[PDB]
Structure 1
Amino acid sequence: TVKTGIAIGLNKGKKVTSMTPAPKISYKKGAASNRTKFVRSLVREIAGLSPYERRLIDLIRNSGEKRARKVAKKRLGSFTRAKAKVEEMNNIIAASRRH
């Protein structure tokens, strides 16, 4: 925000006139490109599914997304990674059955 010029409290700190630095493209390090998406989709079509992904699909069908996410967290080590994998498999299910 705007520093309040005093040494304590909310937004504490000295007040100097602000400048906005140019956004460095290294901060755009994880972004996806159209060709990158194309390659990943083609490679997915060619290679298919890993066995743990297959049983994640089965769990999503039968035992629930909560249990699928828990099994994915067991096999990945990270809750955010389990969320990402389960959402990816959900998109795959929707595209492979409905559309």
Structure 2
Amino acid sequence: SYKKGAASNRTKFVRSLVREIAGLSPYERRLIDLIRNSGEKRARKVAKKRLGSFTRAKAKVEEMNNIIAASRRH
């Protein structure tokens, strides 16, 4: 590899700001509601159905969990 590159933390900062300002999509809202009430076992199925890729569903679930942790723990 010669051009894979890294985030440099600028893309990270911009993406975090965009995630905070934009809010949560209705499907994202349902996913977080299921996580906070049902759990991963129920949220991952919905994520896969909405997306169709298991890896993408797992990544979205992890992102939602991180957002919930950053929000409720402050």
Cα separation, 1, equivalents of 2:2 and 2:27: 33
Deviation at 1:33, TM superposition (A): 2.0
Cα separation, 1, equivalents of 2:26 and 2:3: 33
Unaligned stretches of 5+ residues in structure 2: none
Q: Decide which of 46, 49, 56 is 2:24's aligned counterpart.
A: 49
Computed over aligned residues only, the root mean square deviation of the Cα atoms, in angstroms, reads 1.5
Higher helix share: 2
Query: Which protein shows a greater Rg?
Result: 1
Q: Deviations over 1:67-89 (max 9, x none)?
A: 10110000001000010000000
Q: Deviations over 1:6-63 (max 9, x none)?
A: xxxxxxxxxxxxxxxxxxxx55436322111111111111111111000000000112
Per the alignment, do residues 54 and 36 of structure 1 end up closer, same or farther by CA in structure 2, a change over 3 Å counting? same
- Between the two proteins, what is the percent identity of the paired residues? 100
Unaligned stretches of 5+ residues in structure 1: 1-25
Higher relative contact order (CA closer than 8 Å, sequence separation 6+): 2
